[PDB]
Amino acid sequence: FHSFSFYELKNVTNNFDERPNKMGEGGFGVVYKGYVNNTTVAVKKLEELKQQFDQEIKVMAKCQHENLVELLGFSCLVYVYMPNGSLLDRLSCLDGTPPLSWHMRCKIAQGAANGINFLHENHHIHRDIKSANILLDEAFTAKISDFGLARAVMTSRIVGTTAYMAPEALRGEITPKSDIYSFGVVLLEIITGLPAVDEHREPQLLLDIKEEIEDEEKTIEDYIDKKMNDADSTSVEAMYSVASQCLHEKKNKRPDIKKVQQLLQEMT
Numbered sequence: 001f002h003s004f005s006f007y008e009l010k011n012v013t014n015n016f017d018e019r020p021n022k023m024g025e026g027g028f029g030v031v032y033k034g035y036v037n038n039t040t041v042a043v044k045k046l047e048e049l050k051q052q053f054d055q056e057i058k059v060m061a062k063c064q065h066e067n068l069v070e071l072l073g074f075s076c077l078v079y080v081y082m083p084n085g086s087l088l089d090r091l092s093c094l095d096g097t098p099p100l101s102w103h104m105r106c107k108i109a110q111g112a113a114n115g116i117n118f119l120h121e122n123h124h125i126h127r128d129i130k131s132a133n134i135l136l137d138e139a140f141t142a143k144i145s146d147f148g149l150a151r152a153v154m155t156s157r158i159v160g161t162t163a164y165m166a167p168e169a170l171r172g173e174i175t176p177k178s179d180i181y182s183f184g185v186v187l188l189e190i191i192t193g194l195p196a197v198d199e200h201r202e203p204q205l206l207l208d209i210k211e212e213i214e215d216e217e218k219t220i221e222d223y224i225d226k227k228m229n230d231a232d233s234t235s236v237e238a239m240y241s242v243a244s245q246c247l248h249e250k251k252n253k254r255p256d257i258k259k260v261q262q263l264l265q266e267m268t
């Protein structure tokens with residue numbers, strides 16, 4: 001990768017100008033809009049934080065794929081800019097963007113499954129799969145980001161986003177089966193347009209919807225995001241059946257990523 005000087009980065013981000021050059025937060029840092037080589041970039045300004053820095057670089061060096069973000073360099077971490085932001089924000093229509101159609105959602109879901117597959121083929125565990133870590137390019141192609149906590153098993157330091165974590169990950173296990181569970185939560189956000197956790201909602205956690213539907217108190221049709229005009233029952237049910245399989249409480253009963261990839265392909 002290229003090694004930028006801090007001064008060059010400070011220049012391209014206008015002193016790391018906090019008004020909306022600031023794009024938002026971010027992993028364990030803030031994201032700034034940059035311009036280097038007439039080329040628009042994302043500059044993320046971050047001892048344990050140095051470990052996440054080195055691990056991002058370490059994984060980005062090994063893993064290059066059409067469904068993963070691209071690190072250009074460091075000082076700060078510099079990436080190729082994703083003009084369509086996070087899936088989280090596009091799902092919430094933040095800053096007035098239009099709602100994603102079912103057609104776009106299917107390509108996104110497939111793309112995300114492809115990124116996760118590459119990671120798992122390369123013996124990497126993300127540990128924080130969520131819609132905020134799925135970015136969207138100039139074609140709305142899904143790209144997985146934030147590898148500061150990725151690992152090549154039990155841990156004493158429990159990391160991740162509670163609302164997306166598998167029960168074994170909340171207890172400390174480190175397994176690729178946990179990424180599958182989180183992805184299943186992401187599929188629910190895609191179907192419903194609802195964030196994984198809303199303190200001002202009942203149920204507060206999205207994952208509690210599998211049970212409602214599962215214990216026939218609910219229909220998946222009741223939850224289908226109403227901000228689409230092109231959803232069809234068959235593909236939505238087929239995407240819901242994948243999410244439901246990913247979300248098995250038992251890590252071993254979950255499909256593997258290669259299976260998730262194939263089922264989403266059979267969906268379209």
Ligand SMILES: COC(=O)N1CCN([C@H]2CC[C@H](Nc3nc(Nc4cnn(C)c4)nc4ccc(CC#N)nc34)CC2)CC1
Pocket residue numbers: 023024025026027031042044069079080081082083084085086089094135145146
């Ligand atoms: C007030 O606004 C809020 O609260 N939010 C609104 C912004 N949200 C985030 C959206 C994604 C953003 N990261 C990134 N973004 C963009 N492009 C982009 C973002 N928006 N747009 C319109 C275009 N390219 C990137 C390239 C590489 C990396 C590597 C990392 N990490 N990251 C990003 C962080 C901020 C948080 C909630």
